[PDB]
């Protein structure tokens, strides 16, 4: 039994265009442990991305937090690209 990751993309503070913030990507509920997470700005990988070490849940699944400092704007599309064994191709999850 392999469990696919839940991917949640959200800002640190309530978002306002033009005001400095942090975009988070919380990847959780996955099993096995091998995962690839990338933060994207207009489909392009963000280089300056801070992350937590692999974390352990009591249900035996794993979780991670990937974040980056960002200033939201109307034009910019931010996303979280995740790949896991349960996925045929990487899953791109867009920020709401």
């Amino acid at each position: 039994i392999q469990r696919t990751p839940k991917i949640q993309v959200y800002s640190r503070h309530p978002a306002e265009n033009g005001k400095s913030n942090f975009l988070n990507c919380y990847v959780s509920g996955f099993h096995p442990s091998d995962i690839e997470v990338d933060l994207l700005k207009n489909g392009e990988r963000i280089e300056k991305v801070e992350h937590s070490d692999l974390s352990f849940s009591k249900d035996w699944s794993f979780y991670l937090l990937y974040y980056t400092e960002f200033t939201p704007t109307e034009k910019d599309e931010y996303a979280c690209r995740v790949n896991h064994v349960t996925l045929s191709q990487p899953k791109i999850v867009k920020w709401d």
Partner: peptide, 12 residues
Amino acid sequence: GDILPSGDGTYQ
């Protein structure tokens, strides 16, 4: 909604 880490030691 899940209790999610904001990234500054606090939650949402």
